[PDB]
């Protein structure tokens, strides 16, 4: 399920910005 | 309102308050969050008795990571806005180290905390607060402001139940169009990712990654990579939860929509696209401005300066040198 994809992938948790 | 709110918003815009007042004014009790450059710290200004909510950036590193403009962007729209869905900035100050923005303290923890505990919300608590970030956007888009960072992680729940808008990091004030990378993966337009340019479309498909994420419990694109995530935001297409209404689908599909002409938002109708959207036929947007309706939950509060609402964080002392740095770099702070 994508329930199930989304808690076994790493961006569970706080989620930082990105800057280049 | 949004007439008055111009005039009051370049008054200090044009000239910003500066130095209002200063570390040793507060006692340090436990860090809210961090971030790359410091964190924000619930305190107490011992003079009146009040909890705030403190902000402490490190000069050096924000110089390291040329962050300069970004923070220097942050405190002066934050000491200028005024919205009752915008965190209020207090004071704020600097010393020979740090830079300090003293805030509202926002007890009742961030979305993201309730909304992965929780797994999803409901489509009228999503749509509860979806509304009070269509007019956030109403109000910082009339300033010519962009936001860039729309995220649970960045949406304090105050006591009453209503959203506080913090983290303007990325905040800019922009006519026309802007070019930088920046933002949270999960949540850039592709226009952003395609280094177009692009303007203040892309906080509306920010909305609909939020809406999404607070429906479905999970955004619309993740992958364990940013860049596995920006593949899909630019060529995949954007599918729904069997549960999802067909209402709340509609509205998603005009938000996460690439095409620049068409998405909502960014319409000669504008804000009103999605404000008269069958999706939120049940929103008193009046109402909800005036904070008049009752939020679908209420944050547990066990008296002020209580952070149980707060995950915990590794302290550590604030320094602060004998030495000034990047003085030049922050003279306008
Ligand atoms: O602790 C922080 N913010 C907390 C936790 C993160 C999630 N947002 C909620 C926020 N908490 C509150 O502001 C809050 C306010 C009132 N009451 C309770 C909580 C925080 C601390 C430091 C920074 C911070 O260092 C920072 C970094 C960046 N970037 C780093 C990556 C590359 C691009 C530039 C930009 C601007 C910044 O100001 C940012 C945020």
Excluded at chain 2, 177 to 190: D, I
Aim: net charge positive.
């Amino acid at each position: 399920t994508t329930y199930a994809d989304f808690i076994a992938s790493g961006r569970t948790g706080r989620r930082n910005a990105i800057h280049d | 309102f949004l007439a008055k709110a111009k005039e009051d918003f370049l008054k200090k815009w044009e000239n910003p308050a500066q130095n209002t007042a200063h570390l040793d004014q507060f006692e340090r009790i436990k860090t809210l969050g961090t971030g790359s450059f410091g964190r924000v710290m619930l305190v107490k200004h011992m003079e009146t008795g009040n909890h705030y909510a403190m902000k402490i950036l490190d000069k050096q590193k924000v110089v390291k990571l040329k962050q300069i403009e970004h923070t220097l962007n942050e405190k002066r729209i934050l000491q200028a806005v005024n919205f009752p869905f915008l965190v209020k900035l207090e004071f704020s100050f600097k010393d020979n180290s740090n830079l300090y923005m003293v805030m509202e303290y926002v007890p009742g923890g961030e979305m993201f905390s309730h909304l992965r505990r929780i797994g999803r919300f409901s489509e009228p608590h999503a749509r509860f607060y979806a509304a009070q970030i269509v007019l956030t956007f109403e109000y910082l888009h009339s300033l010519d402001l962009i936001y860039r960072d729309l995220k649970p992680e960045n949406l304090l729940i105050d006591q009453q139940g209503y959203i506080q808008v913090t983290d303007f990091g990325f905040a800019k004030r922009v006519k026309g169009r802007t070019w930088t990378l920046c933002g949270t993966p999960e949540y850039l337009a592709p226009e952003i990712i395609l280094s177009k340019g692009y303007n203040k479309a892309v906080d509306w498909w920010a909305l609909g990654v939020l809406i999404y994420e607070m429906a479905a419990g999970y955004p619309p694109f993740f992958a364990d990579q940013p860049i596995q995530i920006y593949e899909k935001i630019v060529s995949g297409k954007v599918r729904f939860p069997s549960h999802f209404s067909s209402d709340l689908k509609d509205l998603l599909r005009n938000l996460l929509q690439v095409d620049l002409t068409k998405r909502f938002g960014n319409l000669k109708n504008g804000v009103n696209d999605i404000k008269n959207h069958k999706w939120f036929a049940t929103t008193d947007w009046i109402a909800i401005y005036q904070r008049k309706v009752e939020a679908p939950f209420i944050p547990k509060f066990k008296g002020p300066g209580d952070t149980s609402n707060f995950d915990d964080y590794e302290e550590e002392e604030i320094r602060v040198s004998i030495n000034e740095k990047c003085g030049k770099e922050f003279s306008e702070f």
